[PDB]
């Protein structure tokens, strides 16, 4: 802003319908002070705020510690007061380049004596001049007759800490209503055709995301089925619809003749393509025996599922071991 309000008239603004992008200013660290109370810039992710009050002004940095709740001192009781429960972040940066020049500035006016403490959320506007009723002058600038405001000046001899600092206090408000504005959260890339634990706008589920031809509506976000279970999701990042499917769950059956005949066995994974057999929590078991049936030369894709350890044959014989879908396994020949 080209013009800044007085120190005693700190400019108050309301920020809403947006989230502070602290990431851009995090690495840059252009401002020299990011004093956050009871919170840190990195830990703000686990917290949500609805609106912000920004109080912008120019002050002296040395006083920042002095102006705090619970301070024991008479000086702090006549400068400014803040509520004990304060959750605001003070962002302060030096501005001596533009706010300072040759000869100094005499634009700072403060108050030394006041009628009483400043009541919170209290405004007093009036053009009447207050004159002390004890020993009023009314015709001369005598005792008990002085200007209400006192000028304050800063000189070049003052150190960097004593130089004026542009300071904005951002106080985040919390209301009984549920939080609606939250800081941006890192989003992982989009993956498809593989089991994943997907968290879409707070909706958490587990399944495989695949391209869908379903036609949603502009207001519609989620999807459901006859059994009111999630079936499709509209990704907020890009305008498309992704389906959801159960990951792999099935069953494992062992087909084998009587142990008297032979010890050879075959495995049957229910209603699963053979591509997902080895990845189905295998490779962490006995190599010589189990991993042989996890993947091998002889693999058959039947309506029941995937069969490993059997060879499909042109000839058709009477059913011996029932597998299903018209397919049976026999050890003979």
């Amino acid at each position: 802003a080209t013009r800044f309000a007085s120190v005693y008239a700190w400019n108050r603004k309301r920020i809403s319908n947006c989230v502070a992008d602290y990431s851009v200013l995090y690495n840059s660290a252009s401002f020299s002070t990011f004093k956050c109370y009871g919170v840190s810039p990195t830990k703000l992710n686990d917290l949500c705020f609805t609106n912000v009050y920004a109080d912008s002004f120019v002050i002296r940095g040395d006083e920042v510690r002095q102006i705090a709740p619970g301070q024991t001192g008479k000086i702090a009781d006549y400068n400014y007061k803040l509520p004990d429960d304060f959750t605001g972040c003070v962002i302060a940066w030096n501005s001596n380049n533009l706010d300072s020049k040759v000869g100094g500035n005499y634009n700072y006016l403060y108050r030394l004596f006041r009628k009483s403490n400043l009541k919170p959320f209290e405004r007093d506007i009036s053009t009447e001049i207050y004159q002390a009723g004890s020993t009023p002058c009314n015709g001369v600038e005598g005792f008990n007759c002085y200007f209400p405001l006192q000028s304050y000046g800063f000189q070049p001899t003052n150190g960097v800490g004593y130089q004026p600092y542009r300071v904005v206090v951002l106080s985040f408000e919390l209301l009984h209503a549920p939080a609606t504005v939250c800081g941006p959260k890192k989003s992982t890339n989009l993956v498809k055709n593989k089991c994943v634990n997907f968290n879409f706008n707070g909706l958490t589920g587990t399944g495989v995301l695949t391209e869908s031809n379903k036609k949603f509506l502009p207001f519609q976000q989620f999807g459901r089925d006859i059994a009111d279970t999630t079936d499709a999701v509209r990704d907020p990042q890009t305008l498309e619809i992704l389906d959801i499917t159960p990951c792999s769950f099935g069953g494992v059956s062992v087909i084998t003749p009587g142990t008297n005949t032979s010890n050879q066995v075959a495995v049957l994974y229910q209603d699963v393509n053979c591509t997902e057999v080895p990845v189905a929590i295998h490779a962490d078991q006995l190599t010589p025996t189990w991993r042989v049936y996890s993947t091998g030369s002889n693999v058959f894709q039947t309506r029941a599922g995937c069969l490993i350890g059997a060879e499909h044959v042109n000839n058709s014989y009477e059913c011996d071991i029932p597998i299903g879908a018209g397919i049976c396994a026999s050890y003979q020949t």
Partner: nanobody
Amino acid sequence: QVQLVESGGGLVQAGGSLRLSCAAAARFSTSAMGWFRQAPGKEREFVAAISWSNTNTHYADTVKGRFTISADTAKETVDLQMNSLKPEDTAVYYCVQGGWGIRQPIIVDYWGKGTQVTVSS
């Protein structure tokens, strides 16, 4: 006025180990903690500071490497263990709650009642 509970301190034998604990009704995970000591003839001096994540530990170079600070979120307390006690530890210790600041070593927002620590040889 914030009601903070301080445990430990008291009188301890020199050359041993000391345990201090500070508890507040407010969360400690979201707010950085600090321990400060004041003794006669000296003003406020930095002693120990721990950030929100309990990963950034700050101590005075002259006493660094002997104080271990931990934060228990379940108990919502901060514990400090001191080894190789020395007479300089005889002071009054305050536990302060606040946030992390790049400019200052620690930002103080809420002060503590304080605990007297004395060392006898």
